[PDB]
Structure 1
């Protein structure tokens, strides 16, 4: 298969991916791109209600807590609570949103407009001087 000299790496890799897309589209999606499901962003998936309120305890499970805050829909809020990393210029640091919303006794998270991503507000409330 190594025949064409100085093909750009993008043309080679795209050519393979676009070939796979074309064949899957024919075989499994009846040649129709409209049947391909859409998500806001693709990636970050480990291979393993409008108004809500969540109360952290000492025994609260961290993964279940972040899934609950993340929601079901793939949007800014899913990324905020489930991305292990964020970017600082070209560096990849620990997600600070996960650090701040790490669950502990007394933390109360109110999600408002949970179903409309553009308007969703996640509000953490904690005990301050009682």
Structure 2
């Protein structure tokens, strides 16, 4: 398959990806790009309600807690509570939204307009001077 000299690496790899996409469209999506499901962003998936309220305790499981805070829809809240990394210029530091909302006794997260990404507001509240 090594025949054409000086083919750009983008063109070889895209050639292979776009090859598969054309065969997978033909076989499993009757040649129709409209049948392809859409997400906001594709990635960061581990291989393993409008107005809600979540009271954390000492027993509250981290993973369950962030899955609830994140919501079902793929959008900025999903990223915010499930991305393990964010970027600072070119560096990849720990996600500070998952550090701040890390569950513990007293914390109370209220989600408002959960079903509309553009207007959702997550509001963490803790006991401050009683």
Q: CA RMSD in A?
A: 0.2
For residue 81 of structure 2, what is the aligned residue in structure 1? 81
State yes or no: 1:58 paired with 2:58: yes
Give the Cα separation in 1 of the matches to 2:31 and 2:90: 39
State yes or no: 1:92 paired with 2:83: no
TM-score by length of 1: 1.00
After superposition, the C-alpha distances for 1:51-85 in whole angstroms (9 at most, x for unaligned) are 00000000000000000000000000000000000
Runs of 4 or more, structure 1, over 3 Å off, are none
After superposition, the C-alpha distances for 1:27-50 in whole angstroms (9 at most, x for unaligned) are 000000000000000000000000
Unaligned runs of 5+ in 1: none
Give the Cα separation in 1 of the matches to 2:55 and 2:7: 57
- Deviation for aligned residue 1:105: 0.3
Give the Cα separation in 1 of the matches to 2:23 and 2:87: 35
TM-score by length of 2: 1.00
Give the Cα separation in 2 of the matches to 1:32 and 1:75: 25
SS at match of 1:3: coil
Give the Cα separation in 1 of the matches to 2:87 and 2:112: 27
- Deviation for aligned residue 1:104: 0.1
Unaligned runs of 5+ in 2: none
Give the Cα separation in 2 of the matches to 1:36 and 1:4: 33
Give the Cα separation in 1 of the matches to 2:108 and 2:6: 59
User: Number of matched residues?
Assistant: 130
Give the Cα separation in 2 of the matches to 1:48 and 1:63: 12
